[PDB]
Write an enzyme that holds these catalytic residues in place. Structure first.
Site, PDB file in Angstrom:
ATOM      1  N   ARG B  46      -5.726  20.355  -2.648  1.00 30.38           N
ATOM      2  CA  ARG B  46      -5.502  19.186  -1.814  1.00 30.38           C
ATOM      3  C   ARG B  46      -4.015  19.044  -1.549  1.00 30.38           C
ATOM      4  O   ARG B  46      -3.202  19.212  -2.460  1.00 30.38           O
ATOM      5  CB  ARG B  46      -5.999  17.912  -2.513  1.00 30.38           C
ATOM      6  CG  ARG B  46      -7.517  17.850  -2.720  1.00 30.38           C
ATOM      7  CD  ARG B  46      -8.275  17.599  -1.421  1.00 30.38           C
ATOM      8  NE  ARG B  46      -9.725  17.580  -1.614  1.00 30.38           N
ATOM      9  CZ  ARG B  46     -10.539  18.594  -1.349  1.00 30.38           C
ATOM     10  NH1 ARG B  46     -10.079  19.744  -0.892  1.00 30.38           N
ATOM     11  NH2 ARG B  46     -11.852  18.443  -1.533  1.00 30.38           N
ATOM     12  N   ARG B  74       8.864   0.126  12.017  1.00 30.62           N
ATOM     13  CA  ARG B  74       8.162   1.149  11.243  1.00 30.62           C
ATOM     14  C   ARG B  74       7.681   2.168  12.266  1.00 30.62           C
ATOM     15  O   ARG B  74       6.633   1.978  12.891  1.00 30.62           O
ATOM     16  CB  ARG B  74       6.997   0.551  10.481  1.00 30.62           C
ATOM     17  CG  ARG B  74       7.410  -0.456   9.444  1.00 30.62           C
ATOM     18  CD  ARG B  74       8.265   0.157   8.366  1.00 30.62           C
ATOM     19  NE  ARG B  74       8.445  -0.770   7.252  1.00 30.62           N
ATOM     20  CZ  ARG B  74       9.079  -0.466   6.132  1.00 30.62           C
ATOM     21  NH1 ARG B  74       9.685   0.694   5.978  1.00 30.62           N
ATOM     22  NH2 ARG B  74       9.091  -1.343   5.138  1.00 30.62           N
ATOM     23  N   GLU B 107      15.084  -6.601  -3.952  1.00 29.66           N
ATOM     24  CA  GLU B 107      14.785  -6.424  -2.539  1.00 29.66           C
ATOM     25  C   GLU B 107      14.631  -7.759  -1.832  1.00 29.66           C
ATOM     26  O   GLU B 107      14.942  -7.859  -0.644  1.00 29.66           O
ATOM     27  CB  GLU B 107      13.524  -5.590  -2.353  1.00 29.66           C
ATOM     28  CG  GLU B 107      13.634  -4.169  -2.864  1.00 29.66           C
ATOM     29  CD  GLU B 107      14.294  -3.197  -1.885  1.00 29.66           C
ATOM     30  OE1 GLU B 107      14.441  -3.505  -0.683  1.00 29.66           O
ATOM     31  OE2 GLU B 107      14.681  -2.105  -2.336  1.00 29.66           O
ATOM     32  N   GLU B 111      16.660  -7.963   1.507  1.00 24.44           N
ATOM     33  CA  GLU B 111      15.877  -7.900   2.726  1.00 24.44           C
ATOM     34  C   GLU B 111      15.670  -9.249   3.378  1.00 24.44           C
ATOM     35  O   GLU B 111      15.406  -9.296   4.580  1.00 24.44           O
ATOM     36  CB  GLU B 111      14.513  -7.247   2.463  1.00 24.44           C
ATOM     37  CG  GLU B 111      14.612  -5.802   1.998  1.00 24.44           C
ATOM     38  CD  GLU B 111      13.289  -5.039   2.053  1.00 24.44           C
ATOM     39  OE1 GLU B 111      12.213  -5.676   2.173  1.00 24.44           O
ATOM     40  OE2 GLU B 111      13.330  -3.788   1.969  1.00 24.44           O
ATOM     41  N   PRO B 129      -5.540   7.092  -1.357  1.00 25.34           N
ATOM     42  CA  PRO B 129      -5.481   8.122  -2.395  1.00 25.34           C
ATOM     43  C   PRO B 129      -6.177   9.428  -2.077  1.00 25.34           C
ATOM     44  O   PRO B 129      -6.140  10.324  -2.921  1.00 25.34           O
ATOM     45  CB  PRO B 129      -6.095   7.421  -3.604  1.00 25.34           C
ATOM     46  CG  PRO B 129      -6.982   6.370  -3.016  1.00 25.34           C
ATOM     47  CD  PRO B 129      -6.249   5.886  -1.807  1.00 25.34           C
ATOM     48  N   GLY B 130      -6.793   9.584  -0.909  1.00 26.93           N
ATOM     49  CA  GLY B 130      -7.264  10.901  -0.523  1.00 26.93           C
ATOM     50  C   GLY B 130      -6.142  11.838  -0.115  1.00 26.93           C
ATOM     51  O   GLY B 130      -6.319  13.058  -0.142  1.00 26.93           O
ATOM     52  N   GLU B 134       0.809   7.426  -3.505  1.00 27.15           N
ATOM     53  CA  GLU B 134       1.580   6.190  -3.540  1.00 27.15           C
ATOM     54  C   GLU B 134       0.787   5.025  -4.115  1.00 27.15           C
ATOM     55  O   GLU B 134      -0.316   4.707  -3.648  1.00 27.15           O
ATOM     56  CB  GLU B 134       2.058   5.798  -2.141  1.00 27.15           C
ATOM     57  CG  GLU B 134       3.009   4.604  -2.177  1.00 27.15           C
ATOM     58  CD  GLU B 134       3.423   4.101  -0.816  1.00 27.15           C
ATOM     59  OE1 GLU B 134       2.724   4.358   0.183  1.00 27.15           O
ATOM     60  OE2 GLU B 134       4.457   3.403  -0.776  1.00 27.15           O
ATOM     61  N   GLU B 157      21.981   1.847   5.218  1.00 31.03           N
ATOM     62  CA  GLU B 157      20.759   2.636   5.186  1.00 31.03           C
ATOM     63  C   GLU B 157      19.944   2.482   6.468  1.00 31.03           C
ATOM     64  O   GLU B 157      18.772   2.853   6.495  1.00 31.03           O
ATOM     65  CB  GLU B 157      19.918   2.261   3.963  1.00 31.03           C
ATOM     66  CG  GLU B 157      20.703   2.322   2.649  1.00 31.03           C
ATOM     67  CD  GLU B 157      19.842   2.105   1.413  1.00 31.03           C
ATOM     68  OE1 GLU B 157      18.602   2.014   1.542  1.00 31.03           O
ATOM     69  OE2 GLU B 157      20.415   2.026   0.303  1.00 31.03           O
TER      70      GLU B 157
HETATM   71  N1  LIG Z   1      -5.602  15.783   0.761  1.00 28.33           N
HETATM   72  C1  LIG Z   1      -6.329  16.797   1.243  1.00 28.33           C
HETATM   73  N2  LIG Z   1      -5.915  18.073   1.261  1.00 28.33           N
HETATM   74  C2  LIG Z   1      -6.693  19.055   1.753  1.00 28.33           C
HETATM   75  N3  LIG Z   1      -7.910  18.822   2.262  1.00 28.33           N
HETATM   76  C3  LIG Z   1      -8.413  17.572   2.306  1.00 28.33           C
HETATM   77  C4  LIG Z   1      -7.631  16.465   1.788  1.00 28.33           C
HETATM   78  N4  LIG Z   1      -8.343  15.343   1.945  1.00 28.33           N
HETATM   79  C5  LIG Z   1      -9.517  15.715   2.520  1.00 28.33           C
HETATM   80  N5  LIG Z   1      -9.555  17.044   2.736  1.00 28.33           N
HETATM   81  C6  LIG Z   1     -10.666  17.827   3.334  1.00 28.33           C
HETATM   82  O1  LIG Z   1     -11.454  16.957   4.139  1.00 28.33           O
HETATM   83  C7  LIG Z   1     -12.769  16.813   3.587  1.00 28.33           C
HETATM   84  C8  LIG Z   1     -13.237  15.385   3.726  1.00 28.33           C
HETATM   85  O2  LIG Z   1     -12.276  14.554   3.095  1.00 28.33           O
HETATM   86  P1  LIG Z   1     -12.662  13.170   2.393  1.00 28.33           P
HETATM   87  O3  LIG Z   1     -11.457  12.797   1.569  1.00 28.33           O
HETATM   88  O4  LIG Z   1     -14.014  13.330   1.717  1.00 28.33           O
HETATM   89  O5  LIG Z   1     -12.788  12.118   3.605  1.00 28.33           O
HETATM   90  P2  LIG Z   1     -11.967  10.732   3.504  1.00 28.33           P
HETATM   91  O6  LIG Z   1     -10.656  11.007   2.808  1.00 28.33           O
HETATM   92  O7  LIG Z   1     -11.762  10.292   4.938  1.00 28.33           O
HETATM   93  O8  LIG Z   1     -12.916   9.844   2.709  1.00 28.33           O
HETATM   94  C9  LIG Z   1     -12.663  17.270   2.135  1.00 28.33           C
HETATM   95  O9  LIG Z   1     -13.901  17.756   1.619  1.00 28.33           O
HETATM   96  C10 LIG Z   1     -11.613  18.347   2.261  1.00 28.33           C
HETATM   97  O10 LIG Z   1     -12.264  19.536   2.696  1.00 28.33           O
HETATM   98  N1  LIG Z   2       9.772   7.742   6.041  1.00 23.42           N
HETATM   99  C1  LIG Z   2      11.072   7.794   5.761  1.00 23.42           C
HETATM  100  N2  LIG Z   2      11.845   8.842   6.070  1.00 23.42           N
HETATM  101  C2  LIG Z   2      13.161   8.864   5.788  1.00 23.42           C
HETATM  102  N3  LIG Z   2      13.797   7.859   5.184  1.00 23.42           N
HETATM  103  C3  LIG Z   2      13.118   6.758   4.824  1.00 23.42           C
HETATM  104  C4  LIG Z   2      11.690   6.661   5.094  1.00 23.42           C
HETATM  105  N4  LIG Z   2      11.258   5.479   4.622  1.00 23.42           N
HETATM  106  C5  LIG Z   2      12.340   4.853   4.098  1.00 23.42           C
HETATM  107  N5  LIG Z   2      13.436   5.627   4.217  1.00 23.42           N
HETATM  108  C6  LIG Z   2      14.800   5.268   3.775  1.00 23.42           C
HETATM  109  O1  LIG Z   2      14.749   4.667   2.502  1.00 23.42           O
HETATM  110  C7  LIG Z   2      15.069   3.277   2.563  1.00 23.42           C
HETATM  111  C8  LIG Z   2      14.082   2.672   1.589  1.00 23.42           C
HETATM  112  O2  LIG Z   2      14.133   1.277   1.686  1.00 23.42           O
HETATM  113  P1  LIG Z   2      13.073   0.421   0.853  1.00 23.42           P
HETATM  114  O3  LIG Z   2      13.185  -0.996   1.386  1.00 23.42           O
HETATM  115  O4  LIG Z   2      13.277   0.708  -0.624  1.00 23.42           O
HETATM  116  O5  LIG Z   2      11.708   1.146   1.310  1.00 23.42           O
HETATM  117  P2  LIG Z   2      10.560   0.752   2.389  1.00 23.42           P
HETATM  118  O6  LIG Z   2      11.000   1.538   3.617  1.00 23.42           O
HETATM  119  O7  LIG Z   2       9.315   1.362   1.771  1.00 23.42           O
HETATM  120  O8  LIG Z   2      10.508  -0.780   2.490  1.00 23.42           O
HETATM  121  C9  LIG Z   2      14.999   2.881   4.033  1.00 23.42           C
HETATM  122  O9  LIG Z   2      15.861   1.795   4.377  1.00 23.42           O
HETATM  123  C10 LIG Z   2      15.385   4.200   4.695  1.00 23.42           C
HETATM  124  O10 LIG Z   2      16.806   4.317   4.719  1.00 23.42           O
HETATM  125 MG   LIG Z   3      11.750  -2.373   2.269  1.00 24.49          MG
HETATM  126 MG   LIG Z   4      14.874  -2.469   1.142  1.00 24.67          MG
END
Ligand SMILES: Nc1ncnc2c1ncn2[C@@H]1O[C@H](COP(=O)(O)OP(=O)(O)O)[C@@H](O)[C@H]1O
Ligand SMILES: Nc1ncnc2c1ncn2[C@@H]1O[C@H](COP(=O)(O)OP(=O)(O)O)[C@@H](O)[C@H]1O
Ligand SMILES: [Mg+2]
Ligand SMILES: [Mg+2]
Ligand SMILES: [Mg+2]
Ligand SMILES: [Mg+2]
Lengths: 202, 205
Positions: B46, B74, B107, B111, B129-130, B134, B157
């Site tokens: 996965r 975002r 924060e 913020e 979590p699939g 996080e 930042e």
């Molecule tokens: N994180 C992952 N990395 C690789 N393959 C994935 C991942 N998540 C899902 N898949 C593929 O997709 C199929 C269906 O995913 P599933 O997680 O059951 O659906 P959902 O996440 O939408 O509930 C899995 O059987 C797998 O083959």
């Molecule tokens: N997806 C991303 N790619 C690159 N940098 C990121 C991303 N998300 C957040 N950052 C950087 O990290 C900082 C994290 O700030 P924080 O408030 O701790 O996180 P969040 O963005 O989850 O609220 C952001 O201000 C940005 O500078």
């Molecule tokens: Mg933030």
């Molecule tokens: Mg912040």
């Protein structure tokens, strides 16, 4: 409400950082600032994994909820067990509807036929770092038909059905036994809406 | 009703591989696990987005029955939303050695300019979590919403944040209408809608 619209941001480019089953993309963009100026070029790494349909299977006659249990390896590092209790859910492919995916997954994952449906809400899982949107529906089911082991074994999907009362499911949210976003959102919604929903469906 | 069937004893993580490392990482987990009908699966892989974990603070004024929201862009919301500027909870990444409460309080100042009084846990959840590890841990924090105003965030930042104050009821109606539609805010505001009466009694005693 919010201050700025898509007129106020330009995405200059997106770069594929990783392409596999999912993708990770670098978005390069500029946007207006609350102080009146324009930002410089900002980059963010964004996990691109498509979007999902989620079904809360609710039996309004019995006041019961159907949960599905399956391993989610990403839960391992922060959870007591990577096996989670969740909502029926699956990825939406091109040209499919949320409701068609929900029905197909309810059959594949829980052996369940679905009757009436209503939207719950559609949410962004974690929009600082992923584009994923999940659209939740509540679906009318007969929980007495929900039992056993499901999932498509040929795709490595092993799923166990659990039936609980609504109040039991919500207690499991409050105790942390159910702790994935889709299920928490769906079950907190149900706790806020069950009276009207049971009346509508009975 | 019993609950989950299997534990960490029932899965073997054979290997993890980092496929991409930049600001975040994409890891490949390789594992086998027990099956409900008896034996062990074969090797499964996965792809998992690894971005660490977060602390989230719902700023609630129990005197006024108001919430403070923070607005920021975002960009990941762009493709599925009318605007990428979202109304959200205070939230920050947790670094090594820092507690959820420490991060939430820091924060809230960075913020939203908010001093926080008491805090209470709401819930800790897995975002999706699939595909991502996080976890986000939400607290509710006591604030004076009459002090909440202006533009905040760390400019160094590229974090540009506007504070908004609304009634709890308006914030919740915005959840129902889809105007607030990020998981952390939905979960926190639905929790508040279920618990606000007792919380206000607890914090205005
Ligand atoms: N994180 C992952 N990395 C690789 N393959 C994935 C991942 N998540 C899902 N898949 C593929 O997709 C199929 C269906 O995913 P599933 O997680 O059951 O659906 P959902 O996440 O939408 O509930 C899995 O059987 C797998 O083959
Ligand atoms: N997806 C991303 N790619 C690159 N940098 C990121 C991303 N998300 C957040 N950052 C950087 O990290 C900082 C994290 O700030 P924080 O408030 O701790 O996180 P969040 O963005 O989850 O609220 C952001 O201000 C940005 O500078
Ligand atoms: Mg933030
Ligand atoms: Mg912040
Ligand atoms: Mg599924
Ligand atoms: Mg499925």
């Amino acid at each position: 409400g919010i201050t700025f619209s898509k007129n106020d941001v330009e995405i200059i480019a997106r770069e594929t950082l990783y392409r596999g089953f999912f993708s990770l993309d670098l978005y390069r963009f500029r946007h207006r600032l609350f102080n009146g100026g324009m930002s410089g070029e900002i980059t963010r790494e964004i996990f691109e994994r498509g979007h999902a349909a989620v079904l809360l299977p609710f039996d309004p006659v019995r006041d019961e909820v159907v949960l599905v249990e399956q391993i989610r390896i990403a839960a391992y590092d922060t959870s007591e067990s990577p096996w989670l209790l969740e909502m029926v859910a699956g990825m939406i492919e091109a040209g499919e509807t949320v409701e068609d995916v929900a029905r197909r997954e309810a059959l594949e994952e829980a052996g369940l036929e679905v009757g009436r449906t209503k939207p719950i809400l559609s949410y962004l899982a974690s929009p600082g770092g992923t584009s994923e949107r999940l659209s939740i529906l509540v679906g009318e089911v007969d929980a007495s038909t929900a039992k056993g082991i499901h999932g498509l074994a040929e795709e490595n999907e092993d799923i166990r059905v659990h039936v609980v009362s609504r109040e039991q499911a919500y207690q499991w949210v409050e105790e942390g036994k159910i702790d994935n976003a889709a299920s928490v959102i769906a079950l907190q919604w149900l706790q806020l809406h069950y009276h009207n929903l049971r009346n509508e469906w009975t």
